[PDB]
Ligand binder design. Structure first.
Ligand code: HEM
Ligand SMILES: CC(=O)N[C@@H]1[C@@H](O)[C@H](O)[C@@H](CO)O[C@H]1O
Ligand SMILES: CC(=O)N[C@@H]1[C@@H](O)[C@H](O)[C@@H](CO)O[C@H]1O
Ligand SMILES: CC(=O)N[C@@H]1[C@@H](O)[C@H](O)[C@@H](CO)O[C@H]1O
Ligand SMILES: [Ca+2]
Ligand SMILES: [Cl-]
Lengths: 70, 573
């Protein structure tokens, strides 16, 4: 899950990515494309992030800017 | 358990070969073409116990070999007048499709300590080192993770975290979680995710990765640009590499966009898989039609890469342990600067020649100092360094590797030799015998293999016998094949591995059933020049062969003269 070469950590699979936090904007959009909204809820459910609040908490815990989600 | 119908490769490479479904899949052990040679017969590298010899001779310190044989005056670098720096760069990008050998992260911390205790195998410092005056210091080194960890019953092997197939896995990933992270899940268009905060003259950049101690930030603390995210985890290691990943990401999205216009009913998955399948074929074509011939030269190319007949499910497509070390030959092609050229192929100011030691992990230079076009034009119109027996590798990588992100500058050539010992790779003569070539036992024989008695002496003085020469050091020491850029030993190892990757790949693009006849006719027209035209602001590009052309304006043409890939035959009936 943590890959490193020559001491330097190059990737940590357990850290949330920034462009994926923006998928929350689809989950909270009441008028979002219902087919896409369901795929994103399946995707996050697969990672053990089952509520929008669990997504946000894990983003903030991983150093991302979770303003916009007060 | 494999399906009997499947249109696309798996992300992990599982099920490529149906009777042996782990072959070439990711996170399995390298294959051994020869048996491991460890100091204790199963795990400890030669050079581990002070005073224990190898075949009756003392183990030369890797850093002393680097100092005495590899070092040379940068003054005297010799440009290769028949190779672009793009020849170097394709080589690295390709390596990152084929192999990555995991190691543990920072008992004792191998990064700050010089104690030899597992997993640390630090390089000790020879007396009178030109750079490291404290002989009690060391260059840090982590041993590669063992394939069967915690076991003496068995002989140590290492892991390949990547799909061995030439399948564009440095774009799409080699494990399914990361492969989903790379995709654009905001829609059904089949796209790779692009950076949301920055753009390169309105063209896509790679997304950002999320690292706790991000190294790209240390290279410029006030620019606060983190490392990029691609299929392979090393994509920010240098901006020339970043530019290639960025290039292929755009091409993916460009092809998925055309394909949707042609097949409006296709869902995102189909679009992603079809584009991914073209990108894969393009990496295969550029590699085997344009890159490998200029590595091996014609003789070796005909001997080790005879013409494709068909898929053979008895061929083992795994990467050999030895290949991960031999294919590092391209370190001898590295120029000590990154060259950026403007839209008239003239030095781009303020800094058109950045020393490599200040571009490692410097993702901020792509975002803030002008995107990927100046970097790509530097690659096409700057010559690669030529390998010569007294000018092997430059000090930017021998003295200053990762200087900005690390307590001490690493020595890449010395790491290659320490890494071959970590991996229990046999020495020079054993690989000569595996390749059916003369094994020199004496200095006069060695001088004749190399056509250089002066270099033969140096090697005997470090190693004691040609049996103990580390594979990488012996391989790059050989004189170059005609119209090629490696000697016979590496030509054999490299050619043999690429033959096996082609013939053992069920999804090789020429294999019956993969593409239609009309698709294979269309794919023959692709070229890396065209792919540059379609996805940047560059309108003048190298003429085929991109890897030979290196001089502006002599070697260049206008983009309008290059036909595009015709996607007509992907239209569904
Ligand atoms: C920008 C130029 C290049 C580097 C910078 C660079 C750096 C590395 C490093 C740090 C390693 C790991 C070192 C170690 O063993 O401790 C490394 C490994 C490999 N390289 Fe390097 N490399 C640069 C450039 C190239 C080029 C042009 C190559 C061409 C073939 C190339 C190959 C390789 C290979 C095959 C490896 C081994 C990878 C593995 O982990 O399995 N590199 N490079
Ligand atoms: C998450 C991500 O990659 N974002 C992009 C978005 O900016 C773009 O509008 C969309 C359609 O092109 O594709 C996706
Ligand atoms: C060493 C170097 O190139 N310095 C630059 C500096 O000019 C620039 O202002 C900064 C961005 O904040 O990135 C760094
Ligand atoms: C079915 C088939 O193609 N058989 C051959 C096999 O005889 C040969 O040994 C192998 C290369 O080792 O290539 C394959
Ligand atoms: Ca691969
Ligand atoms: Cl091997």
């Amino acid at each position: 899950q943590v890959t490193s070469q020559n001491g330097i950590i190059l990737h940590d699979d357990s850290r949330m990515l920034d462009h994926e936090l923006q998928y929350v904007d689809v989950l909270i959009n009441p008028n979002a494309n219902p087919q896409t909204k369901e795929r994103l809820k399946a995707y996050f459910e697969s990672q053990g992030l089952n509520t929008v609040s669990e997504i946000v908490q894990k983003a903030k815990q991983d150093g991302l800017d979770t303003s916009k989600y007060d | 358990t494999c399906p009997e119908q499947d249109k696309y490769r798996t992300i992990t490479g599982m099920c490529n070969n149906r009777r042996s479904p782990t072959l070439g899949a990711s996170n399995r052990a390298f294959v051994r073409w020869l048996p491991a040679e460890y100091e204790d017969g199963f795990s400890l590298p030669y050079g581990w116990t002070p005073g224990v010899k190898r075949n009756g001779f003392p183990v030369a310190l890797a850093r002393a070999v680097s100092n005495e044989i590899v070092r040379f005056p940068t003054d005297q670098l010799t440009p290769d007048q028949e190779r672009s720096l793009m020849f170097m760069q394709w080589g690295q990008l390709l390596d990152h499709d084929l192999d990555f050998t995991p190691e543990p992260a920072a008992g004792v911390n191998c990064e700050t300590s010089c104690v030899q205790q597992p997993p640390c195998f630090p390089l000790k410092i020879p007396p009178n080192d030109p750079r490291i005056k404290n002989q009690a210091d060391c260059i840090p080194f982590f041993r590669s993770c063992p394939a069967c960890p915690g076991s003496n019953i068995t002989i140590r092997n290492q892991i390949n975290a990547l799909t061995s197939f030439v399948d564009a896995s440095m774009v799409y990933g080699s494990e399914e979680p990361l492969a989903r992270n790379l995709r654009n899940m905001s829609n059904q268009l089949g796209l790779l995710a692009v950076n949301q905060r920055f753009q390169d003259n309105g063209r896509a950049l790679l997304p950002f990765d999320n690292l706790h101690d991000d190294p790209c930030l240390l290279t410029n603390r006030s620019a606060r640009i983190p490392c990029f995210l691609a299929g392979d985890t090393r994509s920010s290691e240098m901006p020339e590499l970043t530019s290639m990943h960025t290039l292929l990401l755009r091409e993916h999205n460009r092809l998925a966009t055309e394909l949707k216009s042609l097949n409006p009913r296709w869902d995102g998955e189909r679009l992603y898989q079809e584009a991914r399948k073209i990108v894969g074929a393009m990496v295969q074509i550029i590699t085997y039609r344009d890159y490998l011939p200029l590595v091996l030269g014609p003789t070796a190319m005909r001997k080790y890469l005879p013409t494709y007949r068909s898929y053979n499910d008895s061929v083992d497509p795994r990467i050999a342990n030895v290949f991960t070390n031999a294919f590092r030959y391209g370190h001898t092609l590295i120029q000590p600067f990154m060259f950026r050229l403007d839209n008239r192929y003239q030095p781009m100011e303020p800094n058109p020649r950045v020393p490599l030691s200040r571009v490692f992990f410097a993702s901020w230079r792509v975002v803030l100092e002008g995107g990927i076009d100046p970097i790509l034009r530097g690659l096409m119109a700057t010559p690669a360094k030529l390998n010569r027996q007294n000018q092997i590798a430059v000090d930017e990588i021998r003295e200053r590797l990762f200087e900005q992100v690390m307590r001490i500058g690493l020595d890449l050539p010395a790491l290659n030799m320490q890494r071959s010992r970590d991996h229990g790779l046999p020495g020079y003569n054993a690989w000569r015998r595996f390749c059916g070539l003369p094994q020199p036992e004496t200095v006069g024989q060695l001088g004749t293999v190399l056509r250089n008695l002066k270099l033969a002496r140096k090697l005997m003085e470090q190693y004691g016998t040609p049996n103990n020469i580390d594979i990488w050091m012996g391989g790059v020491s050989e004189p170059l094949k005609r119209k090629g850029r490696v000697g016979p030993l590496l030509a054999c190892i490299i050619g043999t591995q690429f033959r096996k990757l082609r013939d053992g790949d069920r999804f090789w693009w020429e294999n019956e059933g993969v593409f239609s006849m009309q698709q294979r006719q269309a794919l023959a027209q692709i070229s890396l020049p065209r792919i540059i035209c379609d996805n940047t602001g560059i309108t003048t590009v190298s003429k085929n062969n991109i890897f030979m052309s290196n001089s502006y304006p002599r070697d260049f043409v206008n983009c309008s003269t290059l036909p595009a890939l015709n996607l007509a035959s992907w239209r569904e009936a």
